[PDB]
């Protein structure tokens, strides 16, 4: 049911008395092709075990993003430690205009038409954190209407 | 930062210099080589790079790398430099095109022939 994407796999290291110990880290994202998406970061000595840990961590701690019919609902910007990210809704059939980790997380998150841009450092972990941060605090018309106590027609 | 400060003194751009100044915004330049010699490269590598000191037609005196394997270049030969530095030699910034006015193409070359000026071998 859920679609899982592997974003970046790199080899981290650790020096001990014996010498260098090489470990692997796996950044993956999972989602239901709709408002549910979540990212996982796993680490192990082998890449299959790393990707498996990442998928288990990704399937938990997911969030609900109040998205439109196929796009976002307003231009929103997010930040997490090095990646000022900005994204806005686009018309039908323009695709996912995004780079690196952003493309994978958006695609799995179900949006199909979006203009995005990554400022600052484009580190994959930080941008996928910042992207879901912006998505998490993205207001919806019903939420803002109920929040301010007015009708959705009054706010349009 | 402040808009007042920018009004008093506008944002200075950064004028970029060319890394091939002897061409004078021309694609190639003709020159006569005053010396043909070899030199050793920088720290990681080790070889005898074939380079020639050429006097350009605009008065500049620059060094140019002779590409390919083997060359017939001797002094008083009119060659054509085109720009493009070699990372691993200090002060060599230009390449001499093979196949222009005196510099013959690299013999027995069957791949990337266009870059070294050799006619197509007839079957």
């Amino acid at each position: 049911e859920l679609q899982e994407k592997l974003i970046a796999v790199n080899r981290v290291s650790k020096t001990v008395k014996g010498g260098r110990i090489f470990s692997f880290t796996a950044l993956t994202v999972v989602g239901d092709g709709n408002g549910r998406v979540g990212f996982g970061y796993g680490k192990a000595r082998e890449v299959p075990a790393a990707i498996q840990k990442a998928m288990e961590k990704a399937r938990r701690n997911m969030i609900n993003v109040a998205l439109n019919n196929g796009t976002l609902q307003h231009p929103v910007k997010g930040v997490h430690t090095g990646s000022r990210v900005f994204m806005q809704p686009a018309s039908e059939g323009t695709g996912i205009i995004a780079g690196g980790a952003m493309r994978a997380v958006l695609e799995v998150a179900g949006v199909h038409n979006v203009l995005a841009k990554a400022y600052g450092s484009t580190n994959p972990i930080n941008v996928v954190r910042a992207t879901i941060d912006g998505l998490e605090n993205m207001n919806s018309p019903e939420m803002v209407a109920a929040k301010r106590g007015k009708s959705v027609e009054e706010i349009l | 930062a402040t808009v007042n400060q920018l009004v008093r003194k506008p944002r200075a751009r950064k004028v970029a210099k060319s890394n091939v100044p002897a061409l004078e915004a021309c694609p190639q330049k003709r020159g006569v080589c005053t010396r043909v010699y070899t030199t050793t490269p920088k720290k990681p590598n080790s070889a005898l790079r074939k380079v020639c000191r050429v006097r350009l037609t605009n008065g500049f005196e620059v060094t140019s790398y002779i590409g390919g394997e083997g060359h017939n270049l001797q002094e008083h030969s009119v060659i054509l430099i085109r720009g493009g530095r070699v990372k691993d030699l200090p002060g060599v910034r230009y390449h001499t095109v093979r196949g222009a006015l005196d510099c013959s193409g690299v013999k027995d070359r069957k791949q990337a022939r266009s870059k070294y000026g050799v006619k197509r071998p007839k079957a």
């Binding site: 609902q73 231009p75 803002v144 349009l156 | 808009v3 007042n4």
Partner: protein
């Protein structure tokens, strides 16, 4: 010195929301009470009230929905260092129209949508969403 009372008002609102204060108090002004009136009729603040005679003090009763604050982004747009004026055909839509932009027109100060309906531009005081 204190050279922007409107920015000070927005800053008091933002800080009170962050600090979970029920109400904030500041020295009043005819423009502050006007923006407060706009916020109240747009559902951003619960109610406003001005007391005093010689040194009137305006008190804003803040609004909270579902634990967290309602106003999550409020920023001054035309500030004394750089004024911003926009014509009616190029007014901005804050948060795709879900948020509002307090714009001061000739017919009093109103929201951006009201200004578009009424067909006249003005000075853009602040965005609030």
């Amino acid at each position: 010195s204190m050279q922007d009372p409107i920015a000070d008002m927005l800053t008091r609102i933002r800080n009170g929301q962050a600090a979970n204060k029920a109400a904030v108090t500041m020295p009043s002004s005819k423009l502050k009470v006007a923006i407060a009136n706009v916020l109240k009729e747009e559902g951003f603040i619960e109610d406003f009230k001005v007391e005093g005679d010689t040194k009137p003090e305006l008190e804003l009763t803040l609004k909270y929905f579902q634990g967290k604050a309602v106003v999550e982004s409020i920023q001054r747009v035309s500030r004394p260092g750089l004024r911003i004026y926009k014509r009616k055909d190029e007014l901005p839509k804050v948060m795709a129209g879900l948020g509002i932009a307090v714009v001061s027109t000739s017919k009093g100060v109103m929201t951006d949508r009201a200004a578009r309906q009424a067909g006249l531009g003005g000075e853009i005081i602040c965005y609030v969403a």
